[PDB]
Each structure stands twice: as C-alpha cells, then as structure tokens.
C-alpha cells in the first residue's frame, strides 16, 4: 500500500537513492516525489524554480549553488548572475513549511532576507557560503522575525557592514540558536547583546565569532556556553597578563565538548597555550589566520593526537610537518596556505619534503591542499606510492610553469603517478610546468576524477581532448590560461551533456567555436563572458575572454547582464 511505501522511503534520504527509486515505475515516481524532503541544486541555472516546486511539493530543505569555483579567483565579473530572489519568490507561495535554505556563491539581497523572514514561519537554517549582495539590515530582519531560527552561518560571505546593531534585534524570547558563524563581519556586534544571546541559548553548539570580539572578552562568553562543540575565536591579542591568561585557560578547560577551534586573528604566541586543555580531543584546528612561527605551532600540534583536519600557514615549515606526521596518526585533511603569495623567493622553509613527510606518516591522509614554491617528480611519486587512498589532491606551486627544480623536467610524470596510483582520486588541481603528456595520463588513469582545475599548463588541444575523451566520472572542468581552443571543445561536444559545467578563461576558444557549439548543442547554455563589447565587433576567430558552458533543462537564462551572450 501507498502508506507503507512512503514509510519505506522515509529511511532513504540520499539524493541518488531518491532519484533511483523515482525511476523504478510510475507509482514509485509519484510516491517518491510527494515525500522528498530535500533538494540539492548544484547549478541554479540548470533548472527553473517552477519545475522544482511542482515536482517536489513538500520540500523543507533547499540547497542552491550559483557561480562556479573560479569566482573565488575573481574570474567571474560582477553582475554575472546567481540571483536567489526568483527562487525565494517562487518558494514563498508554495513551500509554506520550508525550514532550511543553504546557498553558495549566490547573490542574496536584503529583499531576499526580508521575504524569507516573512514567508517561512518554521524557518530554522540559513547558510550563506561565499554569498554577496546583502547587508546587516537584512540580517536584522532575520534576527527580528525568525522566531525558530537554529543556524545563521555566514561563512566567507561579503556583507555590507552597515552596523553591528543587527544582532540586538534577536528578541528576549528567542532561545533556539544552535550555530552562529559571524566570522566574515567587520562590524562590531553589541557585546552585551551577544553575551545575553549566548546565555539564553542552551542548545548553542557552534559559535564562530568575528574579529571585533577581543581576546579579553572571550572567557566571558565561554563561561556562558560550556556545552560548545565548535568555537571560532575573535581577536587573539592582548597585553600579556597572568589574570587574562588564567581566566581564558579555565573557561576553555570548562568546555569539555570542544572539538573544533578556529579564528586566532593576530594571535600572540603567549596566549596560544590557553587552548591546550582542549588539545587532547581536538579534531579540527584552523590556524589559517595566525601568523605564529613553526616552533609555536609545533608546541600546540604535539598535543593534538586526535586531530583529523588541519588548516595552517606555511609558517609550519617542513620541520613542523615532520612533527605533525609523527604525532597526528588520524589526520585526514591538511591545507597549508601561503603567508606571502606575492613574494617569489621563499620566506619560510616549506618545500616538497613537508608534504612527503605527512604522506609517509599519516595513513588516513586523503585530502591535501598545499601551497609551496618548489616540487619534484620524485616527491610526487613518493606521495602517490605512500597514499594510494588520496581522494582530493590540490597542489599550488606559486610560480606558474615552475619545473621540477632538481631535474628541470615538467611535472607530468609526478602527477601521472598521482592519477595512476590514487584510484579513487575525485579532485585534482594541477600546477607547475606541464605538457600535453600529463593530460594523456589523466585521461588514461583518472577514471574516478570528478573535478579538475588547470592553470598555465598543456601545449595544445590534444591535452584537453585526452581529458574529455578519457575522464569517465568528470563533473566539473575549469581551465585558465592554457593553449586550449576550438578543436577539443567541438570534437567532444556530447561529453559536455554529462558534466555540470566547463569553464575556460584566457584560453584560445574563438567566438566562432562558441557560436557553433551553441548551434550544435541546444540543451547546453554556452555563455560568452567578455567585457570588450559585442563579440561580433571582432573577427569570429578572435578568442573570447571567458566561456562558461553548462547543461540545463531550463534553457537560456533571463538575467544575463550586458557582458554575457548565450549562443
């Protein structure tokens, strides 16, 4: 009976499993759609709001993603798109019971936030990840009105910081906060309102402060929330005083469930030790903002045996990474960011050896993002052989086209070893000197790769061809500054219907190829993004600044600015 099938489905919540059940027969299709609780829309222009709402009438959680990843490198001009308002407007009428909206790289305005606050009485979760377009006034509308709000998470968003007064709009009757991430906000929130908020929210488990909360006020907040599981500090600087340090130490030690620490802006080495009571059970440490030196980092890391995720500046150095490799046997993810990315000569002793050390020492290491100035094929081969379980490998050599510094060869064979030996590698970002041969290796071996990012690499269209011809699992390809043009794109046009998207900027793709691709593939949006005026004002052979291609069931979008043309 229908009621049993719906109950069987209640235990099936994976998107892919949902889609699979929807295709077994027409009856399962109907029962499935009427009880689907969440939708994940990885490209907001792949489908229209109306299509979503009419298929899945009883959705309570929506996740939407807008601009592609290279937006992070400012390669998507302002005004390109990713407007969420059309989605909020459509849902406002139909999804009365909506509880969660999670957005990434979307343009979200105060009008959006006001309409959310007003339309969705049961609204509980707002995650704005790398979004832009709104201000603390929109935030004030959410705080004033969303009586049931549990999560307000603004991670990496660009907010118009009009005033910190917004937070004082949460009323005295509001007690339901579970997660608050305001780390992106420059404006100072009322500290008294913040302390009152934390005090009255007994289920608060994640509190990620902004920089404007000074270190001398931190212990105060921690005393009010001893149940915290995640803490992002505010500022981490003060005059060095025994009373301040002792108050901080005690407050942190009273947080027995703390597992994740971040923030640390302007961190003073004298005050880092106050977190040591936490260290023993910490599983995530984000020291990205702390410009503290290797030895101080090492003293902290020495006593984090349970660490699973570390983000750290290259100040860790090869010596700090050797320590990490012996101490943190459960490490799963390491990200090492550049302290001085605009200086060509090394300012720290961080090289390929640091990454080699961690590859040898941490048997569960499977996700790497590593910025460095030098690399060898030998090191990459050692890494691949040591870690055949690697699933995400992103290596960012600061100098474009830097060869192996010992042999002066391209890094083709080293990355070749990565894709050959790491059979479940799903994400790869390439850098260093690379020829078409690395792409041949990728095509042959990277059969599980879903996301590939390429910059300043390859020799000819043959490189891009090997990737489109060979990479069976490819979902996202993004390319900048490579000698790839018309031939591989057009020869592999049908492959594009199997991918979320393809991005190519500062490559050799002609306007004429984009026009022809658009003609051939009507179910693709082929968007030429060019700030030099109408492309038909230059010869058809002239390369476009950018092209962004994506499959869609919605057809050409209605919100293109003047510098975007759909073919």
């Amino acid at each position: 009976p229908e009621e049993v099938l719906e109950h069987v489905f209640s235990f099936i919540q994976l998107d892919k499993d949902r889609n699979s059940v929807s295709l077994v027969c027409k009856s399962w299709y109907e029962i499935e759609r009427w009880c689907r609780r969440k939708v994940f829309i990885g490209n907001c222009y792949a489908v229209s709001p109306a299509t979503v709402i009419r298929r899945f009438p009883k959705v309570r959680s929506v996740e939407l993603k807008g601009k592609p990843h290279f937006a992070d490198f400012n390669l998507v001009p302002d005004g390109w798109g990713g407007y969420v308002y059309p989605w909020i407007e459509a849902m406002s009428s139909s999804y009365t019971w909506l509880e969660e909206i999670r957005l990434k790289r979307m343009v979200v305005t105060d009008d959006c936030l006001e309409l959310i606050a007003k339309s969705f009485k049961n609204f509980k979760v707002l995650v704005l990840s790398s979004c832009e377009g709104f201000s603390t006034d929109g935030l004030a509308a959410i705080a004033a009105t969303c009586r049931n709000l549990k999560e307000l998470d603004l991670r990496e968003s660009d907010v118009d910081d009009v005033s910190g007064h917004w937070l004082s709009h949460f009323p005295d009757t509001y007690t339901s906060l579970v997660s608050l991430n305001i780390s992106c906000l420059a404006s100072e929130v009322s500290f008294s309102a913040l302390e009152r908020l934390v005090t009255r929210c007994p289920n608060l488990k994640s509190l990620k402060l902004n920089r404007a909360v000074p270190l001398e006020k931190l212990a105060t907040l921690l005393q009010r929330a001893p149940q915290l599981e995640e803490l992002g500090t505010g500022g981490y600087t003060a005059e060095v005083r025994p009373d301040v340090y002792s108050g901080l130490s005690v407050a942190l030690s009273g947080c027995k469930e703390l597992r994740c620490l971040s923030g640390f802006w302007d961190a003073v080495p004298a005050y880092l030790p106050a977190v040591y009571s936490v260290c023993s059970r910490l599983t995530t440490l984000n020291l990205s903002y702390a410009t503290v030196q290797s030895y101080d980092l090492v003293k902290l890391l020495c006593q984090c045996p349970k660490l699973q995720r570390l983000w750290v500046l290259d100040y860790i150095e090869d010596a700090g990474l050797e320590v990490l490799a012996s101490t943190c046997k459960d490490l799963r993810e390491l990200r090492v960011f550049p302290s001085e990315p605009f200086v060509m000569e090394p300012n720290v002793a961080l090289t390929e050896q640091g990454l080699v050390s961690v590859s040898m020492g941490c048997p569960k290491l499977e996700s790497v993002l590593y910025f460095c100035r030098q690399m060898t094929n030998a090191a990459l081969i050692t890494i691949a052989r040591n870690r055949p379980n690697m699933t995400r490998f992103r290596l960012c050599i600061i100098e474009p086209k830097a060869p192996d510094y010992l042999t002066l060869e391209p890094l083709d064979i080293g990355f070749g070893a990565i894709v050959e030996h790491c059979k479940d590698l799903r994400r790869l970002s390439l850098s260093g000197l690379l020829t078409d041969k690395v792409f041949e290796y990728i095509g042959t071996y990277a059969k599980k790769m879903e996301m590939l990012s390429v910059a300043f690499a390859g020799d000819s269209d043959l490189g891009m061809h090997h990737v489109l011809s060979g990479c069976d699992s490819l979902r996202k390809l993004e390319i900048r500054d490579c000698p790839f043009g018309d031939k591989a794109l057009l020869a592999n046009a049908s492959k594009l219907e199997t991918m979320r998207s393809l991005w190519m900027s500062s490559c050799s793709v002609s306007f004429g190829a984009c026009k022809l691709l658009g003609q051939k593939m009507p179910k693709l949006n082929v968007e030429v993004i060019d700030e030099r005026g109408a492309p038909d004002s230059r010869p058809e052979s002239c390369p476009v600044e950018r092209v962004f291609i994506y499959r869609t069931v919605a057809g050409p979008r209605f919100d293109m600015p003047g510098f975007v043309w759909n073919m």
Binding site: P1, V4, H7, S10, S20, L23, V47, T51
Partner: protein
C-alpha cells in the same frame, strides 16, 4: 486473537480477518502488511527499514528485479525523468 501487554502493542487490537496464523505467530513472537494492519509502529519500522536496505545503492532495474515490478515508463518518459534527476537534482 483469531487469525495483555503483548496484544496492546497493536493499536488496531487496542479477531483478525487479515492476518494468517503462520504470520500472526511471528507478530506475537516479536509481515509488513500485518505490521501495518495491526498498526504496530516498531514492527513497521523494523520491516520498512529492512525493505529500504533492499533498495539503497541499487539501480532502478535492480530494484524492480529484487521486487517484481514492471517498467511502465515509455522510453521518452524514462529519459526525461533521468535527465531531470541527473542535471537538476544531483
């Protein structure tokens, strides 16, 4: 019961035309159809989860194989749905 605390698990019970003696025996000892008919929440959950585990990670074809459902989608219809599923909802 014809096919106290044990009986009262069933909200229907709280003379059973729709349950067989063999299946009733199992219900007491503690199927999906009986658990639903007798409105016994926990037996429903156990049995419905077990069924869900027969579906998870399987293709549409494997599903109607383990069950015994025929594909009533026209090829046009099946392509339109699969396309929407993959392009929009994955």
């Amino acid at each position: 019961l014809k096919s106290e605390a044990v009986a009262l698990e069933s909200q229907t019970i709280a003379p059973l035309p729709n349950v067989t003696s063999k299946i009733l025996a199992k219900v007491i000892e503690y199927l999906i159809l009986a658990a639903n008919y007798l409105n016994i929440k926990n037996l429903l959950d156990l049995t419905c989860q077990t069924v869900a585990d027969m579906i998870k990670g399987k293709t549409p074809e494997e599903i109607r194989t383990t069950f015994n459902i025929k594909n009533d989608f026209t090829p046009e219809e099946e392509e339109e749905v699969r396309r929407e599923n993959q392009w929009a909802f994955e």
